[PDB]
Amino acid sequence: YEQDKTYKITVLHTNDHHGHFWRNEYGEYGLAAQKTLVDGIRKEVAAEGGSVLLLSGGDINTGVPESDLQDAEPDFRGMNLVGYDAMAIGNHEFDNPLTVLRQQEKWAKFPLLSANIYQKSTGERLFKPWALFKRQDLKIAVIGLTTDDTAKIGNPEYFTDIEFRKPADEAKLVIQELQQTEKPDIIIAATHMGHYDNGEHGCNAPGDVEMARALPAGSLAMIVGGHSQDPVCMAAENKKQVDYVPGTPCKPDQQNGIWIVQAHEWGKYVGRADFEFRNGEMKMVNYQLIPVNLKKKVSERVLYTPEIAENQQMISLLSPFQNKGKAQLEVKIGETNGRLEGDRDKVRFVQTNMGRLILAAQMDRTGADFAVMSGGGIRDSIEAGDISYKNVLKVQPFGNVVVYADMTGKEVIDYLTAVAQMKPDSGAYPQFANVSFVAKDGKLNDLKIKGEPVDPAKTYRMATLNFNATGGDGYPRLDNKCGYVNTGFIDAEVLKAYIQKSSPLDVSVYEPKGEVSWQ
Ligand code: NI
């Protein structure tokens, strides 16, 4: 690269887009606003003779019905118009068969990268490990890495002849081969692994911090991350800000001479790392997270930072997808031969069939042995007859995320005991599935899971919602348990997909028969 010259690289990034091609109902984010933002940063940087690179940390799939229903086609096409250069493959890129992921690679005009995803039968990579970019006469390599938790999480589906090797180990190999064969001026890793304070990954697969620490110092300029779904803005050494506020300064993490960034989720921000490159080394000049029309409830909603207009061309591209998405919510996904009871004065007093249907859906998605939610979370009934996604969204309107915890029998006893204290005639009244007992005097008698007494030596998987897992309605906190996993699947999508594949539903199968009682 021509010697003793300082060059200017700006790296933009997003991650964990999760189907948010369209603005939300308050005019926040969406790719049309993202397009305007990125186009302006491009024009600015090009007027200063610098270079731009736009990377995604992945998880483009899964999270919004109008996207999910169309296999994220709008999202990938919109990304083409924004002009992404590359993305790392996320675990949610495996929510669909490989057919669909291969199809997303066709739609995408940028490479979907992952070095550590291998075909079992051949020992060969399924995807490109990296991509090379020429910015001016700089040679820049972007490697992709995917969390090796991908196939371990929930009830895994589409991993036929595939495996996920340790990304940290793959990174070593891949960096070494690149330096040897290409001598990139800059290597960046787009990853889908997660940021954990001080590398405290708990029972999750090690993520970016740990990888950064294990690599030779400064051997990557930066890691552009995702999966954990945080704004990586450090309040203190090895401690991210809690409740990071849009439009305030964001200090990215630096670990063993490698900058680690993450732009939260859903296109909420476009992150901007301005670097200067001289003599093979990279210096970070500035870092920020630019909100994409984020708003705070103050009752109305107000911008944090200047309004970014929606690119007209992105609106014309995406609208037909939006509109086709909405229409498809009206279509029959299934049928039931009986009324599923979701009325407030039932679901907050007794176990109902809708409770069991939802919880069945959540167990099925997670591989759980049992499940709980609060009655205040079932928000409508579905009448006998045909069922649409629009019906499911009335029943599950708050967009809670399905999660699970692996717990000892003893932790099961204590959790259920505590939950059993919640009283009828409140939203905190619990719906259970695969649980039986008679509560007497704050104590559970004959406690069983799936017909069997709870063995404190065994591990049980429980499904519920993030809302309850984080202490909603005074439920015991699970989000700090080693073994807690937020799956990222939305309650309503999980209920709809279960209804669709299970239909026609025979509701009798969801009828409680006195498994739980209080005296
Ligand atoms: Ni992920």
470 assigned to a ligand binding site: yes
Q: Which residues pair with 188 in a beta bridge?
A: 142, 222
SS3 355: helix
488 CA distance to ligand 1 centroid (A)?
8
Is 229 catalytic? The answer is yes
- List the one residue out of 23, 11, 95, 2 whose CA is nearest residue 54: 11
Angle at which helix 98-107 crosses helix 73-82, to 10 degrees, equals 30
SS3 321: helix
SS3 34: helix
In 3-state terms the chain splits into helix, strand, coil percentages (rounded to 5) of 30, 30, 40
Neighbour count for residue 492 (Cβ, 10 Å):
21
Cα 252 to the chain's mean position, in Å?
Answer: 20
489 CA distance to ligand 1 centroid (A)?
11
Give Cβ neighbours of residue 205 (< 8 Å, ≥ 6 apart).
Answer: 147, 148, 149, 152, 167, 193, 194
Is 16 catalytic? The answer is yes
Is 378 in contact with 431 (CB distance < 8 Å)?
Answer: yes
- Give the integer Cα–Cα distance in Å for 281 and 112: 27
Is 463 in contact with 405 (CB distance < 8 Å)?
Answer: no
Experimental method: X-ray
Instruction: Please tell me which residue in 34, 61, 229, 466 is annotated as part of the active site.
Output: 229
- Give the integer Cα–Cα distance in Å for 52 and 274: 9
Radius of gyration, alpha carbons of the chain: 24
SS3 100: helix
Phi then psi for residue 8, to 5 deg, are: -115, 115
Handedness of CA 307, 312, 316, 318 (dihedral sign): negative
467 assigned to a ligand binding site: yes
- Give the integer Cα–Cα distance in Å for 282 and 118: 31
Which architecture, in CATH terms, is 1-331?
4-Layer Sandwich (3.60)
> Dmax over Cα atoms in the chain, in whole Å?
82
Neighbour count for residue 247 (Cβ, 10 Å):
16
92 CA distance to ligand 1 centroid (A)?
6
125 assigned to a ligand binding site: no
Indicate the CATH number of 332-518 among 3.30.70.360, 3.40.50.720, 3.90.780.10, 3.40.50.300. Answer: 3.90.780.10
Which amino acid is it at 279? N
Resolution in A: 2.3
Distances (CA, A) of 291 to 250, 315, 374, 406: 12, 19, 34, 36
326 CA distance to ligand 1 centroid (A)?
26
For the chain, domain boundaries: 1-331, 332-518
Distances (CA, A) of 28 to 22, 24, 33, 259, 309: 9, 5, 9, 28, 11
- Give the integer Cα–Cα distance in Å for 450 and 439: 17
Where are the alpha helices (H) located in 349-485, listed in sequence order?
A: 353-366, 389-395, 409-420, 466-469
